[PDB]
Design an enzyme around this catalytic site. Structure first.
Site, PDB file in Angstrom:
ATOM      1  CG  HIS A 292       0.771   4.648  -2.641  1.00  0.00           C
ATOM      2  ND1 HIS A 292       1.722   4.307  -3.575  1.00  0.00           N
ATOM      3  CD2 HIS A 292       0.076   3.515  -2.373  1.00  0.00           C
ATOM      4  CE1 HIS A 292       1.631   3.019  -3.843  1.00  0.00           C
ATOM      5  NE2 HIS A 292       0.631   2.515  -3.135  1.00  0.00           N
ATOM      6  CG  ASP A 293       5.568   7.761  -3.189  1.00  0.00           C
ATOM      7  OD1 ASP A 293       5.453   6.606  -3.651  1.00  0.00           O
ATOM      8  OD2 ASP A 293       5.711   8.762  -3.922  1.00  0.00           O
TER       9      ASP A 293
END
Length: 120
Positions: A60-61
Protein backbone atom coordinates in the site's frame (compact mmCIF):
# COMPACT_ATOMS: atom_id res chain seq x y z
CA UNK A 1 17.44 4.50 -15.88
CA UNK A 2 17.75 1.74 -15.80
CA UNK A 3 14.00 1.07 -15.47
CA UNK A 4 10.80 2.94 -16.19
CA UNK A 5 9.51 3.51 -12.70
CA UNK A 6 5.78 3.73 -13.59
CA UNK A 7 5.70 0.41 -15.53
CA UNK A 8 7.71 -1.50 -12.94
CA UNK A 9 5.65 0.06 -10.14
CA UNK A 10 2.41 -1.15 -11.71
CA UNK A 11 3.85 -4.64 -12.28
CA UNK A 12 4.92 -4.94 -8.63
CA UNK A 13 1.65 -3.38 -7.39
CA UNK A 14 -1.01 -5.04 -9.49
CA UNK A 15 0.53 -8.06 -11.23
CA UNK A 16 2.93 -9.77 -8.81
CA UNK A 17 1.61 -12.00 -6.05
CA UNK A 18 1.92 -10.50 -2.57
CA UNK A 19 4.63 -13.04 -1.63
CA UNK A 20 6.71 -12.25 -4.72
CA UNK A 21 6.24 -8.54 -4.01
CA UNK A 22 7.69 -9.15 -0.53
CA UNK A 23 10.55 -11.13 -2.04
CA UNK A 24 11.39 -8.38 -4.51
CA UNK A 25 11.03 -5.69 -1.85
CA UNK A 26 13.46 -7.48 0.47
CA UNK A 27 16.26 -6.85 -2.06
CA UNK A 28 15.38 -3.16 -2.68
CA UNK A 29 16.07 -3.31 -6.42
CA UNK A 30 16.24 -0.01 -8.31
CA UNK A 31 16.32 1.80 -4.97
CA UNK A 32 17.58 4.98 -6.66
CA UNK A 33 14.29 5.11 -8.59
CA UNK A 34 11.73 3.22 -6.49
CA UNK A 35 10.70 4.28 -2.99
CA UNK A 36 10.68 1.09 -0.88
CA UNK A 37 10.01 2.82 2.47
CA UNK A 38 6.97 1.85 4.53
CA UNK A 39 5.53 2.58 7.95
CA UNK A 40 4.04 -0.92 8.08
CA UNK A 41 0.58 0.34 9.08
CA UNK A 42 1.92 2.08 12.18
CA UNK A 43 -1.46 3.87 12.08
CA UNK A 44 -3.22 0.59 12.95
CA UNK A 45 -3.69 -0.76 16.49
CA UNK A 46 -1.95 -4.01 17.50
CA UNK A 47 -4.22 -6.92 16.65
CA UNK A 48 -3.98 -10.69 15.98
CA UNK A 49 -3.77 -10.17 12.21
CA UNK A 50 -1.42 -7.21 12.12
CA UNK A 51 1.78 -9.13 11.44
CA UNK A 52 0.05 -11.18 8.72
CA UNK A 53 -1.12 -7.88 7.17
CA UNK A 54 2.37 -6.31 7.18
CA UNK A 55 3.24 -7.08 3.51
CA UNK A 56 -0.13 -5.66 2.42
CA UNK A 57 0.86 -2.49 4.28
CA UNK A 58 4.21 -2.50 2.52
CA UNK A 59 2.52 -2.75 -0.87
CA UNK A 60 0.00 0.00 0.00
CA UNK A 61 2.83 2.41 0.90
CA UNK A 62 4.70 1.32 -2.23
CA UNK A 63 1.69 2.41 -4.28
CA UNK A 64 1.13 5.76 -2.57
CA UNK A 65 4.77 6.77 -2.38
CA UNK A 66 5.77 5.83 -5.90
CA UNK A 67 2.63 7.28 -7.51
CA UNK A 68 3.44 10.53 -5.68
CA UNK A 69 7.08 10.45 -6.82
CA UNK A 70 5.81 9.84 -10.38
CA UNK A 71 3.26 12.70 -10.21
CA UNK A 72 0.50 10.11 -10.82
CA UNK A 73 -1.27 10.36 -7.49
CA UNK A 74 -4.90 11.48 -7.57
CA UNK A 75 -8.20 10.27 -6.14
CA UNK A 76 -8.66 7.65 -8.87
CA UNK A 77 -5.22 6.07 -8.45
CA UNK A 78 -5.53 6.38 -4.66
CA UNK A 79 -8.76 4.37 -4.82
CA UNK A 80 -7.10 1.78 -7.08
CA UNK A 81 -4.26 1.36 -4.57
CA UNK A 82 -6.68 1.25 -1.60
CA UNK A 83 -8.76 -1.42 -3.38
CA UNK A 84 -5.59 -3.39 -4.13
CA UNK A 85 -4.81 -3.17 -0.39
CA UNK A 86 -8.24 -4.56 0.52
CA UNK A 87 -7.61 -7.41 -1.94
CA UNK A 88 -4.22 -8.10 -0.34
CA UNK A 89 -5.70 -8.07 3.17
CA UNK A 90 -8.50 -10.46 2.18
CA UNK A 91 -5.92 -12.74 0.56
CA UNK A 92 -4.01 -12.83 3.87
CA UNK A 93 -7.21 -13.62 5.83
CA UNK A 94 -7.97 -16.65 3.63
CA UNK A 95 -11.65 -16.61 4.59
CA UNK A 96 -11.27 -16.18 8.35
CA UNK A 97 -14.31 -14.12 9.37
CA UNK A 98 -12.75 -12.19 12.28
CA UNK A 99 -9.75 -11.45 10.08
CA UNK A 100 -11.97 -10.08 7.30
CA UNK A 101 -13.72 -7.81 9.80
CA UNK A 102 -10.34 -6.42 10.83
CA UNK A 103 -9.34 -6.02 7.17
CA UNK A 104 -12.48 -3.91 6.67
CA UNK A 105 -11.30 -1.52 9.41
CA UNK A 106 -7.89 -1.13 7.71
CA UNK A 107 -9.62 -0.39 4.40
CA UNK A 108 -11.98 2.13 6.02
CA UNK A 109 -9.02 3.90 7.59
CA UNK A 110 -7.14 4.36 4.32
CA UNK A 111 -10.25 5.33 2.33
CA UNK A 112 -11.06 8.05 4.84
CA UNK A 113 -7.59 9.16 5.96
CA UNK A 114 -5.18 7.93 3.30
CA UNK A 115 -4.54 11.50 2.16
CA UNK A 116 -3.11 12.22 5.63
CA UNK A 117 -1.89 8.95 7.20
CA UNK A 118 1.74 9.28 6.05
CA UNK A 119 1.64 12.95 7.10
CA UNK A 120 0.95 11.63 10.60
Amino acid sequence: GAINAPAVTDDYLFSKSLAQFSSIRSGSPYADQLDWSSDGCSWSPDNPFGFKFLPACHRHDFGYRNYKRQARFNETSRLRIDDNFKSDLYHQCAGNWACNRTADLYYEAVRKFGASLEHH
